């Protein structure tokens, strides 16, 4: 059986050139009028997971994409 790709992880995770794993910062959908404008700015973004969380994601998409 070919190991399947974890379709949830498709739109939320990114493989990197070196071989680290990325995602988008969170809290941006109704936690808005908070705000602060620098939070709202800092959140829409993107960023690298701390580390412990790497193996799993890697196993989520074997193809990298």
């Amino acid at each position: 059986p070919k190991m399947k790709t974890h379709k949830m992880a498709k739109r939320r995770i990114k493989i990197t050139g070196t071989g680290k794993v990325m995602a988008f910062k969170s809290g941006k959908r109704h936690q808005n009028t908070g705000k602060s404008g620098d939070e709202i700015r800092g959140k829409g973004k993107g960023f690298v997971l701390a580390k412990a969380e790497w193996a799993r994601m890697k196993l989520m998409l074997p193809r990298g994409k």
Binding site: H6, A9, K10, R11, F24, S26, R29, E53, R56, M60
Partner: protein, 71 residues
């Protein structure tokens, strides 16, 4: 018959069980627990019963294959 494979080509496998040599009683598995049990399952992306990291993270953008250029 003269021939022999390379030193370090073929390690003999783990035969768990088979006495106090040796991995006695529990064959690595530890004492009790869901991990101890014999069934196919968990599997790998199951954290606690909780609410998973991947499930907590925002989805971004659609998906498109488009064209890719051979370098």
């Amino acid at each position: 018959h003269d021939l022999k494979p390379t030193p370090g080509s073929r390690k003999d496998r783990k035969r768990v069980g088979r006495g106090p040599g040796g991995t006695d009683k529990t064959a690595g598995r530890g004492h009790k627990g869901q991990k101890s049990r014999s069934g196919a399952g968990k599997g790998a992306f199951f954290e606690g019963g909780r609410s998973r990291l991947i499930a907590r993270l925002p989805k971004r953008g659609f998906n498109n294959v488009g064209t890719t250029y051979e370098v």
